[PDB]
């Protein structure tokens, strides 16, 4: 992002390799979860357009998602330009030429220009604007490849099994799913998602173990 010299200039500092590594870990682990979006926003705090593109190149192997981001970015850039028509006249010594859509996406603009816009009084916040376009894109990605569920409800290593059951069923009840899907959830996913020690106990019960029998079996595991 942007930092000030002891000589007073606003200069660019590349994103830390640790911030970058975190972002790449988030994407690796949080596939296409709604959870990616808040993380992306936290990790990209202060980012210039150049920095944002740096983050995206790091997860570019996701080609279908990158394609979706491209189309969103092109769309928003096109609307920006409609709202911000080019003005050919001279620029007064105390004005600054406005960014185009491609300047915001970092395509036709330099880091120096991005910093000049971002730190103007008041700012032309091209980092924040580009970040919004990316977020629009990410929301479209999750919404396209992501249904609601209970799949990530997992018993904690020290979680009492009765508490896990409660969470599981609460999540279950609030979903809009067919009964046959919910039947699989109660009869198989609950055990599937129990912790290692409880699952092993649960899987050694009989053919017709009742949930009460399950709770009895896993109490204090």
UniProtKB/Swiss-Prot annotation:
The modification Phosphoserine is found at residue 16. Phosphorylated possibly by host MAPK1; this phosphorylation is necessary for Pin1-mediated virion uncoating. The record marks 89-90 as: Cis/trans isomerization of proline peptide bond. Residues 57-95 are annotated as: Interaction with human PPIA/CYPA and NUP153. It is found in: Virion. Residues 145-221 are annotated as: Dimerization/Multimerization of capsid protein p24. Coiled coil: none annotated. Forms the conical core that encapsulates the genomic RNA-nucleocapsid complex in the virion. Most core are conical, with only 7% tubular. The core is constituted by capsid protein hexamer subunits. The core is disassembled soon after virion entry. Host restriction factors such as TRIM5-alpha or TRIMCyp bind retroviral capsids and cause premature capsid disassembly, leading to blocks in reverse transcription. Capsid restriction by TRIM5 is one of the factors which restricts HIV-1 to the human species. Host PIN1 apparently facilitates the virion uncoating. Homodimer; the homodimer further multimerizes as homohexamers or homopentamers. Interacts with human PPIA/CYPA; This interaction stabilizes the capsid. Interacts with human NUP153. Interacts with host PDZD8; this interaction stabilizes the capsid. Interacts with monkey TRIM5; this interaction destabilizes the capsid. This is Capsid protein p24. It comes from Human immunodeficiency virus type 1 group M subtype B (isolate NY5) (HIV-1).
